């Protein structure tokens, strides 16, 4: 089979998750590290208006890297395939937590809630807006910790030159000049109510009528919301970007300290500099080459084979594993 | 969410087994009869006429090889089909993971392939996209037909000449050819990096015979894989065809078994004890097949009847 060729040098491939629509999941083993993986197959034949957001999502995940981001390991292409070979998230969506039980406690929501904060800060701190914040795009890892996917909707605010109606915030919708990070805090200020409430803080039979909902910003506080629940759901649900919380001010706010007592830490654990020596070393012997040709090389960061096996190699470092490629 | 509080009424969800774009599809247990469903959900801003067309079809297809419609549902945002339950996986991915079927397991297989689609040929449509990945294995490893947003262009790899060129049942049988290799072969007969050279090869309709491949497969091919759609075997030759026979000696058997007129006493009168009526008003209720949770019901009710379970409503 033609279009398997080059990946089945790599990977094994393990059973299929499913299909929907143009993008088939199968897991599969690295096979010089024995990691598992995820791997997205894309049919190019089916995926059609899909094609430039494939590529706005490669293009982010190749710059971005964090412990609460879905990590991109390699991509590769075929006449009729796109694979993105992915970081193991068997844990589910966020979403499908959400509707299997009624609504988080806060102490539940806080735990989840810090975990989106540090990836999306992340993002921002990158030049990045993710633009469709929603917890069908929050999986969760073997470890039960968030990963943020779908990067496909993302933009430079200012670079060179957006998703579900309900996450999506009053200037977005109305297609306004911004620094962009901002709408972002806006769909973390929905996501943070549908945890605690169980359902969204805007929501209507029509798309005309959630719009107008969503411009006038007015929304219920249930009954079962502590005071300082509403004080920062009202910080973040704010109609004018401008007077919304800021990320600096949300990392330490006292509702996201509250039971932890200090301030959310976003900064990566994962650098594209700063190369691990173990994991070099290693690489070094298996390709018979010296370390100083395998460091320039890794540091091109081309997202082929030698990129899959430095990143799933560190991960086996994390795991506790031997630093061994097999 | 507003989109999802109709379908929560009906079906309990469980996790996704995939996304691609406006498309998702999540397992989940329909709550009257404990039987599990895939629901696939179709987001309306994020193709329309092609998701319309597939419906179109289902609500008149009804056949042991194709994959049932129970219901559909639609909000605002959203259009939700209630499928049959394929655990199995696609045909594409078993075929894979053996690197290729013996001439013995192709037969099991295909002979379920010719079923289904000498019935949809019977109800005058053309699948027009047959190829493995369009081929489910539900839970007893049966067969079932998918993806009919193409009717009566698809995979190139998988298309006639005749289409290719614009000048539907012969079609169809092609399709079959390239699949009936790809299952002995694990490859296909033609195939390219380019969309012309790839045309070019289909058009002059040669391709490698592997030396695994029996006399009898190899005739078989010949008469599926004729470029001229006037020469190609017939749909009524296939079904008692010598290769097809071999160790079964009775021809395919494409009926359904799956009427929309005859109905079964026993999901009927069940169904009148849950919705409070006689027999009669519920049958004629049944009969208007509106593909809303009736009909999901009663066609569950049906399925947990012919797996041997108590024909009961919880
Ligand atoms: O890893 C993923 N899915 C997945 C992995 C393992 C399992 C599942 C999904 C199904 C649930 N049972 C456990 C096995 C996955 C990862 C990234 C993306 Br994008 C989409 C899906
Ligand atoms: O049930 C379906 N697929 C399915 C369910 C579970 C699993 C799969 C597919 C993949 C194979 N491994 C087991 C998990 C299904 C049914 C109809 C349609 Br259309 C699309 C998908």
């Not at 009528?209 to 509403?230: F, N, Q, T």
């Not at 190369?275 to 960061?301: A, F, K, P």
Request: glycine share 6%.
């Amino acid at each position: 089979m033609k279009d398997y060729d080059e990946l089945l040098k790599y990977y094994e491939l393990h059973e299929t998750i499913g299909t929907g629509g143009f993008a088939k999941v199968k897991l599969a083993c690295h096979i010089l590290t024995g990691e598992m993986v995820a791997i997205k197959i894309m049919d190019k034949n089916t995926l059609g208006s899909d094609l430039p957001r494939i590529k706005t999502e490669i293009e982010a995940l190749k710059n971005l890297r964090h412990q609460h981001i879905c990590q991109l390991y390699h991509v590769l292409e075929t006449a009729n395939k796109i694979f993105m070979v992915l970081e193991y998230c068997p844990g589910g969506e966020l979403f499908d937590y959400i509707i299997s039980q009624d609504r988080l406690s806060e102490e539940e929501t806080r735990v989840v809630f810090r975990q989106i904060v540090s990836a999306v800060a992340y993002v921002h701190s990158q030049g990045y807006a993710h633009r469709d914040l929603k917890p069908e795009n929050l999986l969760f890892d073997e470890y039960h910790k968030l990963k943020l996917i779908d990067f496909g909707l993302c933009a430079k605010p200012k670079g060179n030159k957006c998703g579900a109606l309900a996450y999506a915030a009053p200037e977005l919708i109305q297609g306004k000049s911004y620094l962009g990070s901002e709408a972002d805090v806006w769909s973390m200020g929905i996501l943070l109510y549908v945890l605690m409430c169980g359902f969204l803080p805007f929501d209507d039979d029509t798309a005309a009528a959630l719009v107008a909902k969503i411009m006038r910003g007015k929304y219920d506080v249930p009954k079962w919301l502590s005071p300082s629940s509403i004080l920062l759901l009202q910080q973040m649900l704010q109609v004018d970007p401008k007077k919304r919380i800021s990320m600096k001010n949300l990392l330490n706010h006292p509702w996201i300290m509250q039971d932890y007592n200090y301030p959310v830490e976003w900064q990566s654990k994962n650098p594209f500099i700063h190369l691990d020596d173990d994991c070099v070393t290693e690489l070094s012997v298996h390709h018979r080459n010296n370390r100083q040709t395998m460091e320039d090389l890794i540091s091109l960061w081309q997202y082929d084979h030698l990129t899959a096996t430095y990143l799933l190699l560190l991960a086996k470092k994390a795991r506790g594993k031997p630093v061994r490629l097999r």
